[PDB]
C-alpha cells in the first residue's frame, strides 16, 4: 500500500587521513538499490538490486555526478560546523543527511523529508509542510537564516512532492516483481522450560517482507504486556525479515496465552496457541 | 572579467597531438571543457572542481585527457587526434557547481581542424580594388573592396587599416567564405570585404588604406615535402593610396 | 530536453519571439537562455523560474504549466544576430545546449539607391571586381556555382558617423568575357 524512497548520507572526518569517509545509500521501502562509497574503487554509484541495473548509462552517469556533489557539500559542511561549534581539528566528527518521500496506495504524495544531524544529534530539518526549517540549537539557527534568504525550501519542496515521487513510481513498476511483493510471515511457536515452575513461549515470524510487522501476546484474550520480551525486527540476509516475541509463563497455564501476528501479506491476522 | 583561452586556431594532421589552454575567472573553482562540433551547440567533455575531476563520464579516454593541477589554469589534450575531432574547444568557469543553478562564463574558443594531409593548406592571396568614380559622383562616397583568395583553411582574419590604425566603421566582411570550387571536397576559399568612406576622404592622397589578412597555418614541427612554399602562419596585405582624381 | 526552431529571420526594429518547448521540465528546473555570437563563446542572456522575467536585454514569458516558454527581444538590432540556446536545468545539472535557434536580423534600408560599380585592381588593371551596393533588403542576391562567376551574399555596412547603412555584394571572374553591368542577373 504505502511506499517510500529514501537516501541516507553519512560522512565522517578522518583527521590525519584527510579525505573524509562518505557513504550514501538509497532505499525503496525496505529494499536497498544504490550505494556510493568514497573508499571504493569504482568512484561511481553502484547498483545493489537487480531491477535498477536495467537503468541505462545516462542514469548511472547522472547519479554518479549528483552523488559526488553530495560528497563535496558534506566535506565542506564538516569544516563549517567545526567552526560554528568552535571545535578543534583533532577530533573525528560525523555529519548525516536524510531525505526522501512517501506515497499512499494511490501512489500520490503523502509526506517528504530533508534532515541533518551532526555527531548523533539533530542539526536542521525541514518541517512537515516543507515551507520552513527547524533549527535544533543556536548554531543551526545560522544555517536557517541562510537557507531562508536563498529560498531553499521552495526548491527542495518541488523535488520531494514532484521528482522524488515520480522516480519511486518508476522504480516500483520496474521492480514490480520484487518491491511490490507481499511476503507473508512463516510462523511457529516454541516451548522451553526454565524450571518446574515457569516456562518460556516464543512466537516466531520468519521470511517476511516488508519489515513492518506487529507481534503481541494476549492472555485470555487481553493484551499481556508484562512478562514479555520482543527482539528488534532483524534482516534475514536474503531480503526478508525476522522477529519473535516471548512470554515466560506459569506452567500449566500455557494454553492461556495466544500470539497475534499482523502483517500486510496476511488476508486476516493470525492467532497461534501452543500445541504439544 | 572574461575566461581566456590559447590558441585561437590550430591545424593538425591525423594521428598527431594537440593541446588547448584555459585560465578561468580568478576564484571560479569549477572549470569546464566543452566541444562544439560545427552547427551543434557545446557538449561537455570534462568538469573540474578545484583540482579534481567531478565529471568525466562522457570524455573519450582513448584520446582525450585534461589537467588542473593547481586548481586554476587547465589544459585539455587530444592524442592521437582523429578527423572527427575537428571542432571548437570551449572552456568555461563557475563560482561553484552546486546550489540553485550556477551561471557559467565561457572563453572564446580554440578552432581545431584535423586534416588527413597538410598538402592542401594554402595561404591567402589579397587584392584591394579602388573606388569607382561612378560611385563618387553619384553618392560622394567611396567603397574600397578587398578580396582574399585561394586560402585553405578558413583559419583567417581580415582587418582594414587607415593610416596605421584599424577601423571598423564602414567595414563589412563576408560572414562566410566562398568555396572557389563548391563541387570539390577540400576546396580553397575566397572572402571579400568592403571599406566605405567619404569621397573627400578618399581623394586625399595622404590617406593610406590597407587590407590585412592574418592566416593561421603550419609551424616549426610540421613537415613540408611539397615543392611549393611552406604555408606558415603569415600576414598578407594589400594597399591603396588616396587619389585627388 | 528543450526543443526550439533551428533558424529564425527578422528585420531590425521589430519584436522577435523565439519559442522554447520543454514539456518534461522538472519541477525545480529553471529556464535559461545563452546567446552565442559568431566566433565568440556562449554568454548568459536571461534566466527565469516560474514567474515571467525581463532584464534590460530581453523578456522571458513563462506560462503557469511551464510546458513551453517564449523569449522576447523587444526591438532587434543587426548586432543581435546570433544563436540563442534554451536550457531547462537546475543546480548540479550539466548544461545541455542543443542546436539553438540561429536568429538573423536583416536591415531596413531607408533610402535605397541600387547601382552596380566596377573597381580596378590597385595593381594589375587587368584584375577587376564588380560591386552591387545601395540596394534594399527585399533585393536578394543569388549565388552562382556556374563557371568562374563568384558572387558574395549581401553584407550590410554601417557608417555610424553619418548614420548610414548599405547592403553590398561583390562579384568577380578571371574570364575576359566578364561583364559588370549585368553580372548580378
Amino acid at each position: 500500500g504505502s511506499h517510500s524512497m529514501r537516501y541516507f548520507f553519512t560522512s565522517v572526518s578522518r583527521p590525519g587521513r584527510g579525505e573524509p569517509r562518505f557513504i550514501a545509500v538509497g532505499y525503496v521501502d525496505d529494499t536497498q538499490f544504490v550505494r556510493f562509497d568514497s573508499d571504493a574503487a569504482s568512484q561511481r554509484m553502484e547498483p545493489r538490486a537487480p531491477w535498477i541495473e536495467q537503468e541505462g548509462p545516462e542514469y548511472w552517469d547522472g547519479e554518479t555526478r549528483k552523488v559526488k556533489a553530495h560528497s563535496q557539500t558534506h566535506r565542506v559542511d564538516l569544516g563549517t560546523l567545526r567552526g560554528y561549534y568552535n571545535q578543534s581539528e583533532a577530533g573525528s566528527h560525523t555529519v548525516q543527511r536524510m531525505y526522501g518521500c512517501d506515497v499512499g496506495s494511490d501512489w500520490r504524495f503523502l509526506r517528504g523529508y530533508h534532515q541533518y544531524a551532526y555527531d548523533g544529534k539533530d542539526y536542521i530539518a525541514l518541517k512537515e509542510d516543507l515551507r520552513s526549517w527547524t533549527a535544533a540549537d543556536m548554531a543551526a539557527q545560522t544555517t536557517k537564516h541562510k537557507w531562508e534568504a536563498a529560498h531553499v525550501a521552495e526548491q527542495l519542496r518541488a523535488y520531494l512532492e514532484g521528482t522524488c515521487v515520480e522516480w519511486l513510481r518508476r522504480y516500483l513498476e520496474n521492480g514490480k516483481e520484487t518491491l511490490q511483493r507481499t511476503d507473508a510471515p512463516k510462523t511457529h511457536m516454541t516451548h522451553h522450560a526454565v524450571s518446574d515452575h515457569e516456562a518460556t513461549l516464543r512466537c516466531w515470524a520468519l521470511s517476511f517482507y516488508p519489515a513492518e510487522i506487529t507481534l503481541t501476546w494476549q492472555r485470555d484474550g487481553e493484551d499481556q504486556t508484562q512478562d514479555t520480551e520482543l527482539v528488534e525486527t532483524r534482516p534475514a540476509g536474503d531480503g526478508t525479515f525476522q522477529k519473535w516475541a516471548a512470554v515466560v509463563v506459569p506452567s500449566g497455564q500455557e494454553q492461556r496465552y495466544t500470539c497475534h501476528v499482523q502483517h500486510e501479506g496476511l488476508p486476516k491476522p493470525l492467532t497461534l496457541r501452543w500445541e504439544p | 572579467a572574461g575566461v581566456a583561452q590559447s590558441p585561437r586556431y590550430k591545424i593538425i594532421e591525423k594521428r598527431q597531438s594537440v593541446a588547448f589552454w584555459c585560465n578561468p575567472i580568478s576564484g571560479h573553482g569549477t572549470l569546464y571543457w566543452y566541444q562544439q562540433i560545427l552547427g551543434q551547440g557545446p557538449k561537455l567533455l570534462i568538469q573540474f572542481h578545484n583540482n579534481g575531476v567531478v565529471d568525466d563520464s562522457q570524455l573519450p579516454k582513448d584520446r582525450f585527457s585534461a589537467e588542473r593541477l593547481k586548481g586554476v589554469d587547465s589544459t585539455l589534450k587530444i592524442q592521437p587526434a582523429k578527423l572527427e575531432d575537428s571542432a571548437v574547444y570551449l572552456c568555461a568557469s563557475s563560482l561553484d557547481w552546486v546550489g540553485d543553478g550556477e551561471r557559467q562564463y565561457f572563453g572564446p574558443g580554440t578552432r581545431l581542424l584535423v586534416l588527413e594531409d597538410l598538402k592542401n593548406v594554402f595561404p591567402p592571396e589579397v587584392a584591394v580594388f579602388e573606388p569607382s568614380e561612378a560611385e563618387i559622383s553619384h553618392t560622394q562616397k567611396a567603397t574600397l573592396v578587398c578580396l582574399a583568395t585561394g586560402f585553405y583553411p578558413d583559419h583567417v582574419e581580415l582587418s582594414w587599416w587607415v593610416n596605421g590604425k584599424e577601423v571598423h566603421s564602414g567595414v563589412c566582411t563576408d560572414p562566410q567564405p566562398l568555396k572557389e570550387q563548391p563541387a570539390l571536397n577540400d576546396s580553397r576559399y575566397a572572402l571579400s570585404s568592403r571599406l566605405r568612406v567619404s569621397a573627400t576622404f578618399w581623394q586625399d592622397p595622404r590617406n593610406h588604406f590597407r587590407c590585412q589578412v592574418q592566416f593561421y597555418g603550419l609551424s616549426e614541427n610540421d613537415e613540408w615535402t611539397q615543392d611549393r612554399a611552406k604555408p606558415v602562419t603569415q600576414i598578407v596585405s594589400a594597399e591603396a593610396w588616396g587619389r585627388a582624381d | 530536453k528543450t526543443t526550439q526552431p533551428i533558424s529564425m529571420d527578422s528585420y531590425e526594429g521589430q519584436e522577435v519571439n523565439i519559442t522554447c518547448s520543454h514539456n518534461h521540465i522538472a519541477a525545480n528546473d529553471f529556464i535559461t537562455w545563452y546567446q552565442q555570437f559568431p566566433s565568440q563563446g556562449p554568454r548568459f542572456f536571461i534566466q527565469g523560474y516560474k514567474t515571467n522575467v525581463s532584464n534590460e536585454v530581453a523578456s522571458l514569458f513563462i506560462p503557469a504549466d511551464r510546458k513551453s516558454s517564449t523569449l522576447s527581444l523587444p526591438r532587434v538590432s543587426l548586432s543581435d544576430t546570433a544563436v540563442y540556446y534554451c536550457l531547462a536545468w537546475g543546480g548540479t545539472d550539466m548544461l545541455i545546449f542543443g542546436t539553438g535557434t540561429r536568429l538573423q536580423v536583416f536591415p531596413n534600408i531607408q533610402n535605397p539607391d541600387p547601382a552596380v560599380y566596377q573597381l580596378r585592381d590597385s595593381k594589375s588593371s587587368d584584375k577587376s571586381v564588380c560591386l552591387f551596393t545601395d540596394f534594399d533588403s527585399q533585393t536578394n542576391v543569388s549565388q552562382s556555382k556556374d563557371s568562374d562567376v563568384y558572387i558574395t551574399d549581401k553584407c550590410v555596412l554601417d557608417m555610424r558617423s553619418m548614420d548610414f547603412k548599405s547592403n553590398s555584394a561583390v562579384a568577380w571572374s578571371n574570364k575576359s568575357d566578364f561583364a559588370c553591368a549585368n553580372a548580378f542577373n
Binding site: 537516501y7 547522472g62 559542511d77 560546523l81 526548491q155 523535488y159 | 546550489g99 | 522538472a26 543546480g91
Partner: peptide, 9 residues
C-alpha cells in the same frame, strides 16, 4: 534519483 539541489550549511 538523487536531488540536483545541494546547499552548504
Amino acid at each position: 534519483s538523487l536531488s540536483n539541489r545541494l546547499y552548504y550549511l
